[PDB]
Amino acid sequence: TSVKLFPPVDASYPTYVDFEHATRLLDHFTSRKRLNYQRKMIKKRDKFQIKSWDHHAGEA
Amino acid sequence: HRFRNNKFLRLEPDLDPKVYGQTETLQKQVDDNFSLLLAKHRLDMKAAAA
Amino acid sequence: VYRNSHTKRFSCRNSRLKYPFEQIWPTLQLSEDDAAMFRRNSRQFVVDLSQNITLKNKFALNKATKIPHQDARALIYESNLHLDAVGEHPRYLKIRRVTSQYGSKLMNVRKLRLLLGFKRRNFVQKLYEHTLLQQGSNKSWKVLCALEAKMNLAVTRMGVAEDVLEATHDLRQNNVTLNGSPAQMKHARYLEPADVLAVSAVSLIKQRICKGLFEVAPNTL
Amino acid sequence: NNPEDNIAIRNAPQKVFQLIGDPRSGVADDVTHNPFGEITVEMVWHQLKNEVYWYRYEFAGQTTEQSHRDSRLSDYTKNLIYLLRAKNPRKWTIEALAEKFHIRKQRVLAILALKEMEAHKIESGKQLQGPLSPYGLKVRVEDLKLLSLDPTGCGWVEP
Amino acid sequence: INMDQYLRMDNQDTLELLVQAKDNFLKKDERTIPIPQSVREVMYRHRWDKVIVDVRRLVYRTKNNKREQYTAMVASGNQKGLLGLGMGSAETAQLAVARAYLDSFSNLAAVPLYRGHTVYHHVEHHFQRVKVTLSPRTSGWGLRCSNLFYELCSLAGIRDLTVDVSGATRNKFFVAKAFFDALQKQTAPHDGVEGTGVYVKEVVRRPVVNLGTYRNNGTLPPKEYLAT
Amino acid sequence: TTRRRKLLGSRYGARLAKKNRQQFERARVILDCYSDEELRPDSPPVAVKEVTINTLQTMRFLFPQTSKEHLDIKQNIASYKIFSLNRELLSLLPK
Ligand SMILES: [K+]
Ligand SMILES: [Mg+2]
Numbered sequence: 072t073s074v075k076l077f078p079p080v081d082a083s084y085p086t087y088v089d090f091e092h093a094t095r096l097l098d099h100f101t102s103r104k105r106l107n108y109q110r111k112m113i114k115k116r117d118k119f120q121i122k123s124w125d126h127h128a129g130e131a
Numbered sequence: 132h133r134f135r136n137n138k139f140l141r142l143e144p145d146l147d148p149k150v151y152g153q154t155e156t157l158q159k160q161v162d163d164n165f166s167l168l169l170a171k172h173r174l175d176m177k178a179a180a181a
Numbered sequence: 182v183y184r185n186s187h188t189k190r191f192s193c194r195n196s197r198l199k200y201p202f203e204q205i206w207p208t209l210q211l212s213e214d215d216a217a218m219f220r221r222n223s224r225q226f227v228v229d230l231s232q233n234i235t236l237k238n239k240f241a242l243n244k245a246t247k248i249p250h251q252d253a254r255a256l257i258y259e260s261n262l263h264l265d266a267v268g269e270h271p272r273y274l275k276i277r278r279v280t281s282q283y284g285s286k287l288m289n290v291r292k293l294r295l296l297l298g299f300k301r302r303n304f305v306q307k308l309y310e311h312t313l314l315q316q317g318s319n320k321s322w323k324v325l326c327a328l329e330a331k332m333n334l335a336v337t338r339m340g341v342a343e344d345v346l347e348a349t350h351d352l353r354q355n356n357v358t359l360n361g362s363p364a365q366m367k368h369a370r371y372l373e374p375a376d377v378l379a380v381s382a383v384s385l386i387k388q389r390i391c392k393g394l395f396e397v398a399p400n401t402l
Numbered sequence: 403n404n405p406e407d408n409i410a411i412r413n414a415p416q417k418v419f420q421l422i423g424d425p426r427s428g429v430a431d432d433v434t435h436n437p438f439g440e441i442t443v444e445m446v447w448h449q450l451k452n453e454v455y456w457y458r459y460e461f462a463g464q465t466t467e468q469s470h471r472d473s474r475l476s477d478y479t480k481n482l483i484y485l486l487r488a489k490n491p492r493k494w495t496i497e498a499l500a501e502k503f504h505i506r507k508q509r510v511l512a513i514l515a516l517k518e519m520e521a522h523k524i525e526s527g528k529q530l531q532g533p534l535s536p537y538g539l540k541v542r543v544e545d546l547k548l549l550s551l552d553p554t555g556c557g558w559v560e561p
Numbered sequence: 562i563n564m565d566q567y568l569r570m571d572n573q574d575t576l577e578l579l580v581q582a583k584d585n586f587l588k589k590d591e592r593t594i595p596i597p598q599s600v601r602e603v604m605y606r607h608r609w610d611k612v613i614v615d616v617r618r619l620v621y622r623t624k625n626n627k628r629e630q631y632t633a634m635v636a637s638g639n640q641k642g643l644l645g646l647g648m649g650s651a652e653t654a655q656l657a658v659a660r661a662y663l664d665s666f667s668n669l670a671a672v673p674l675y676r677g678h679t680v681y682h683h684v685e686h687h688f689q690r691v692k693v694t695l696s697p698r699t700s701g702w703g704l705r706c707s708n709l710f711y712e713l714c715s716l717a718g719i720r721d722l723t724v725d726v727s728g729a730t731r732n733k734f735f736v737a738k739a740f741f742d743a744l745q746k747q748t749a750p751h752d753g754v755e756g757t758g759v760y761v762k763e764v765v766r767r768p769v770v771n772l773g774t775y776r777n778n779g780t781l782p783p784k785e786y787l788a789t
Numbered sequence: 790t791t792r793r794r795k796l797l798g799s800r801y802g803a804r805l806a807k808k809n810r811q812q813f814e815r816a817r818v819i820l821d822c823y824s825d826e827e828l829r830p831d832s833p834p835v836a837v838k839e840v841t842i843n844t845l846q847t848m849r850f851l852f853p854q855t856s857k858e859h860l861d862i863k864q865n866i867a868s869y870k871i872f873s874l875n876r877e878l879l880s881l882l883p884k
Binding site: 422423424427428429430431432433434435436448450451 | 564567568571673674675676677678749750751754755756757758759760761762763
């Protein structure tokens, strides 16, 4: 059995990973539509709210 | 001491874990100690009785 | 896609190395010829010194023990005329151009897919988008945290699977439980700092570990 | 509490106060460098039979040392934490135990949970059976005394 | 292969190698390596990286045939606070690059940076028929710029910045030169501080965005401005 | 074609409370369930008297030296174990 404790402070991988190069490419394909849907759901986490069931077009 | 290598004066070698199993070897070691104690009581009774 | 690029032998390709491929699977058994091919990326010959040096020796010559994670790229792939390329005329030193970035950036994204267990590109793209909204100041570390929060990678860290691919198969068979019951959205969720993982296929996992270490176990109990 | 034998004292927050100028006429903070550290990477291992390299990333590598000790505490230490908590929960709080063993509070609570689960298995009769039975020990909390290394050198005294 | 010898070589002290390498490099003549001896000594205190900026070909016609000449620019700099540009001309591309690389070490210069990762304030520079803008960003935000400037930022050590370049950018020598000059127009809080009679103290203030950004994201600015 | 029975899980505490209530109550006190106001149970806390530990490593893996310090630790554990066995035996010896 294992238990997690907190956000990692160290990590080891069997190879060198260049995160800056990986993210530079991925920053070119970002979708504003998907980001906006995520932003709206952050403000509507609580199901037991009146304001979470208003009239809107689409999913959020 | 003539038995330089056989320091513990054993009659049989210890069981190999890779062939007989770790649990079997551990049980064998426990049985060996009890046999030594039992033999000691066995010799004394025979001498006292006969 | 029954390609060789989807096998462990040829999974990773790096065009900046003498041998274009790279070994990243710590449990893969290589033949003598295969080992020789990979060893060419580890040993280099120095003219003035007339000796062979290794990648680890190169770091020592540069006095590099803990360096900024962006600076390791300049050490692995470049050369210097005062430490490791002494005796070579400057005319024959290799200097990169700004046109090589695309190959490098594409390679790194392939590495993230390989570490996660041969995931699709759209899977990685959404993972990057997810981190953009989570709180934190350093973008690079947020990406690293997201990788660790993945369930299959966490199972690998426990030490019950040979690699991430074997861990993924275990999840599909429900050999590991989350908070006492099989996980929901196990391939898409993230683990939290208070989650508990346990093995439900106890007999299966115990056999797996014993067999792996049977040869390295001592013959005296 | 000496830096030679106290890694925790070595890994302590630093109070930084650096200036440029003349304190009698005018000064300004020195902001020409970053003394708080940054993310680092290091090569740890190299397998010569498979040609595999291992790299380790650390969030605070430049301001910490020997961070690998925290997650590799001996079994004796873990049992001691479990016994101290059971003996006197009033004094042995999570804060006190964390300070005593130089670990975090989250680790202390996690260790207690795992030890508690193991104890139930032993009591239920699922572990330490057969030849290994003698190694399951039942301890009464009252009959427990913690010794201290008060005398310089080798030797543990009751108080 | 002998694995035992391979292991022995891998785990060895490199002090002997360092001494031999340093002696050989410092004893070379000024023709093969025209780097001054003083510069060679400093090369062992840092880690260096280099990149090619651009290669141009010039053609001169004659009675019978044409004469081709190559010019190149190479940028080199230690990871933190050192950058230099060198130019070299030769009859071949390979020779021009080599001469430019050697010339870069003779043009090293210091780059001021706030905490070693960004710029002190907004910078706008006008090199002939080129415009470059630099905007500071919070630590950890990242770099937003073209590929050419991304390579230059790695050499100097800049970690968070936004760069925008416009105008006649066909000649990449001018673009690199404009970027170099912009970094040298910054001002620091400690410039002539003795004549102020005050304590110039660093403070923590979060930057803001424009109103349109808040509306689109559906978020709010700091409460200090919303007070009503 | 699988003969493996379907697995529907449950939390560890849920199963323990139905199998051994005494162990469940002890765990709550140890795991600091009475410090937070929100999570504080209504039932009063129970005092902890006996615990069980595993000493296999401390006896045969961790203390190899011949100094008095290591010998004393092993002897104390062995002596305490014998007392526990004797107390159990005395409860059964009388006719
Ligand atoms: K793909
Ligand atoms: Mg533009």
